[PDB]
Design a protein around this ligand. Structure first.
Ligand SMILES: NC(=O)C1=CN([C@@H]2O[C@H](COP(=O)(O)OP(=O)(O)OC[C@H]3O[C@@H](n4cnc5c(N)ncnc54)[C@H](OP(=O)(O)O)[C@@H]3O)[C@@H](O)[C@H]2O)C=CC1
Ligand SMILES: NC(=O)C1=CN([C@@H]2O[C@H](COP(=O)(O)OP(=O)(O)OC[C@H]3O[C@@H](n4cnc5c(N)ncnc54)[C@H](OP(=O)(O)O)[C@@H]3O)[C@@H](O)[C@H]2O)C=CC1
Ligand SMILES: O=C(CC[C@@H](c1ccccc1)P(=O)(O)O)N(O)CCCc1ccccc1
Ligand SMILES: O=C(CC[C@@H](c1ccccc1)P(=O)(O)O)N(O)CCCc1ccccc1
Ligand SMILES: [Ca+2]
Ligand SMILES: [Ca+2]
Ligand SMILES: [Ca+2]
Ligand SMILES: [Mn+2]
Ligand SMILES: [Mn+2]
Lengths: 411, 411
């Protein structure tokens, strides 16, 4: 009964942690068949992975390196894969009857596209890309009601933790992103844990002058610059608030951000009786990824057991909204609903990059996002799925342009 | 539609907490029907409960206050309960078709008798009385394999926590005490949390001098004297290690006692992937009691929500077995199996009472228990239930007598 898995974004942080835990688990017993690997342009790395996992399908997005990949894969003896390119190749892979589960480790806005096609092919979608949910949550809800056999299984660590705290006898009566998920699971409230990022103990005046260099300074987890910046501003956590609302149908007044600097308790679920269940481990994306691929079961690993006595102390505190104004903006956009989350995500893409490139200061990030949100006006939501997607693209693009206009006007 | 419940030991700590949470849950809808109340001799307090809850059945164990009870209840107009006494009364209630679930909040080895009869009648037994499981675990396993519709649902707080941490999709395919429970639930290891008791930070020289007055000075939970003294010696945790083994089919080497002095995390389960799930709340037996009666569902309470940021800090350390030798004894008895747990429990009943009454010192408790364990010789386990029960009572009585003899000899 092998688990037939595609890795989308196989050469990045999520995709490499995915293949790492697949490789480790397979040494204990052969449970995973890596059926497909897909990247943008890392042709050499993709060759290396093909050599180890020998998947039925290989796909690279950039046409320019397609021929190169074909050439490299000739070196592999007794190995005749289907080698594909672009959106076309992504669609072929998602339509393959032999693939059951697709890890979406593709970053940014691009991630939404393969997520959509994985859903349209009624797959299990192990979704790490939170921006897809924040930008397109209602659309994805509509799409999951057309494609009844598709499921999104959360991989973002906090959302994986929440999901792991549930009773699957209740989860199996519903699915993530469905209205009423929280009611069917008897969920009352969520505690959404955060590392707090590097700036958690800075004063307002220190924040005024922090730089992206300071933000990119060996945090509790090593990741790409974009999510690292978001962790520093706590807009990551704001996006994760919206992600929680969409995935689990929890009201915004019932999502509490809590700063947990040790990063052992990964989030907690308060049920209607007031009992609280939490998921814990060392910080490591292997467990969230693995659970997304084994759910509703678990399998043996050789990971180091948690030593709670050694950890010794766990601490919890409320984040300061004045120091981390991005969090308030995310709640405000979420509560407004409509396409406000799309606008939040898009404007933050721009503001994050401005700050990364030393073009704006820390409080300018929230200033720009706030000004874009204030310029948007709620749009009638199309009932037509294709039209709705068009609206999300139009609004995303508008909001990025607006954020850049605001920066250029001031500058 | 209402859950039909009996409360055994209705006037004590567990029973009163059970009626408190039932009263709250019954404010608007008829969620529970309190069908029966049973006590030992608290006739006046039973009468008062009867006036409120008007159960079909009343039972009092001590037949010397049966007449007092009949006389008091006549004062309640238009109420015609079945009024019973002793063992016969207990058995009639257990055999009633009108009763689905029984809360066992009777203390000491005496609680085993009603536990056995409730199982024999295929009831759901919400079991707080841990001494029953320690004294008679293997026998209760045998009885639960006969009486296929009976279940034990744990009420002891740590064991309720463990049970809540599990995935009900898996729990529903087995039941507590059943062989292979841990395999079916993908359990690797248990972190069994403890308050540590009042003596947790004493030096060895300080601990030599402790008295029961010191042990009974206002702990983190107000409870009666026996469990309060067991908390102080950590024999309560020792008993709970054995209870964990039997309820969840977890090997002794996979049960780790952790002292968690804030008493917010109530225990944790490590699964085979090394993910850990924990259950948390303020100390309050209403959640474990309610859960036992609603499982596999949860219902709404009006308990104060957990304020994790206010709690702020959680700590964990390993207990010192030199300071708390009772823990070691319990592991030793458990690992030996046979009737060694019966002897542990019985000898502890004596030693606890001697210390309570200022007859022996703290380290004498563990000395006495150790000596009785070293005295006992393994017996062939009776193959039939009636004989097995007689053997348990014989061995329990022998071990109490042995502990008393050791005490009599030493002074
Ligand atoms: N890293 C982490 O621990 C966490 C990340 N996340 C989320 O996970 C997502 C993925 O992040 P991460 O692994 O950090 O990202 P990376 O930038 O490390 O990896 C992105 C991957 O996607 C590939 N890719 C990019 N565009 C395309 C495309 N058009 N078609 C196919 N493949 C594509 C890249 O290929 P190439 O190598 O060719 O560039 C790379 O393999 C993000 O949305 C992030 O928010 C969530 C929680 C934590
Ligand atoms: N209190 C707590 O928070 C916790 C308790 N436990 C366990 O729960 C059990 C009960 O503890 P707790 O409620 O503290 O004890 P209590 O001493 O407060 O209450 C005992 C109850 O049992 C009744 N009882 C005693 N003997 C008999 C009998 N022969 N027939 C019928 N009823 C009888 C008493 O009746 P009467 O009033 O007439 O004396 C009373 O109603 C113990 O095994 C303990 O280990 C487990 C976890 C925590
Ligand atoms: O979204 C992220 C990255 C950012 C957040 C974070 C949280 C915990 C540690 C470091 C960083 P934030 O700072 O926004 O709270 N993540 O899910 C953590 C991935 C690493 C991980 C951590 C715990 C459990 C398993 C995997
Ligand atoms: O067995 C007991 C009593 C003794 C142990 C304890 C644990 C937590 C606080 C104080 C005392 P020990 O000292 O042996 O760890 N109990 O289950 C707690 C009952 C009260 C309670 C606590 C947490 C959750 C719900 C109810
Ligand atoms: Ca009398
Ligand atoms: Ca559960
Ligand atoms: Ca083991
Ligand atoms: Mn996250
Ligand atoms: Mn307990």
């Amino acid at each position: 009964k092998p688990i037939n898995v595609a890795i989308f974004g196989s050469t990045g942080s999520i995709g490499t942690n995915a293949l790492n835990i697949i490789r480790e688990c397979n040494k204990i017993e052969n449970v995973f068949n890596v059926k497909a690997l897909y990247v943008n342009k890392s042709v050499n790395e993709l060759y290396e992975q093909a050599r180890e996992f020998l998947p039925e399908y290989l796909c690279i997005h950039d046409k320019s390196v397609y021929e190169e990949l074909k050439e490299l894969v000739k070196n592999i003896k007794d190995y005749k894969p289907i080698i594909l390119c672009g959106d076309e190749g992504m669609k072929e892979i998602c339509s393959s009857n032999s693939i059951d589960k697709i890890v979406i480790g593709i970053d940014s806005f691009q991630g939404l596209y393969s997520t959509m096609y994985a859903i349209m092919n009624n797959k299990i979608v192990a979704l790490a890309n939170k921006e897809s949910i924040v930008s397109a949550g209602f659309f994805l809800k509509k799409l999951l009601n057309i494609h009844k056999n598709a499921k999104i299984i959360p991989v973002d660590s906090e959302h994986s933790a929440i999901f792991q705290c549930l009773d699957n006898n209740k989860v199996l009566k519903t699915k993530c992103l469905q209205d009423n998920f929280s009611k069917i699971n008897n969920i009352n409230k969520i505690f959404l844990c955060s590392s707090g990022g590097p700036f958690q103990n800075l004063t307002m005046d220190e924040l005024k002058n922090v730089t992206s260099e300071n933000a990119l300074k060996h945090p509790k987890w090593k990741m790409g610059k974009k999510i690292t910046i978001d962790s520093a501003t706590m807009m990551n956590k704001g996006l994760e608030v919206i992600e929680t609302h969409f995935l689990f149908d929890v009201d915004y007044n019932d999502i509490e951000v809590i700063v947990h600097k040790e990063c052992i308790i990964h989030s907690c679920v308060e049920f209607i009786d007031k009992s609280v269940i939490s998921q814990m481990y060392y910080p490591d994306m292997q467990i969230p990824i693995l659970y997304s691929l084994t759910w509703p079961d678990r399998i043996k690993t050789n990971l180091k057991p948690l030593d709670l006595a050694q950890v010794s102390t766990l601490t919890f505190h409320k984040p300061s909204l004045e120091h981390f104004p991005c969090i308030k903006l995310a709640y405000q956009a979420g509560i407004k609903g409509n396409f406000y989350p799309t606008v939040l995500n898009a404007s933050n893409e721009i503001a994050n990059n401005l700050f990364l490139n030393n073009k704006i200061k820390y409080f300018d990030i929230s200033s720009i996002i706030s000004q874009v949100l204030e310029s948007f006006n709620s749009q009638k939501v199309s009932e037509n799925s294709e039209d709705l997607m068009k609206q999300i693209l139009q609004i995303h693009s508008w909001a990025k342009d607006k954020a850049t206009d605001i920066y250029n006007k001031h500058n």
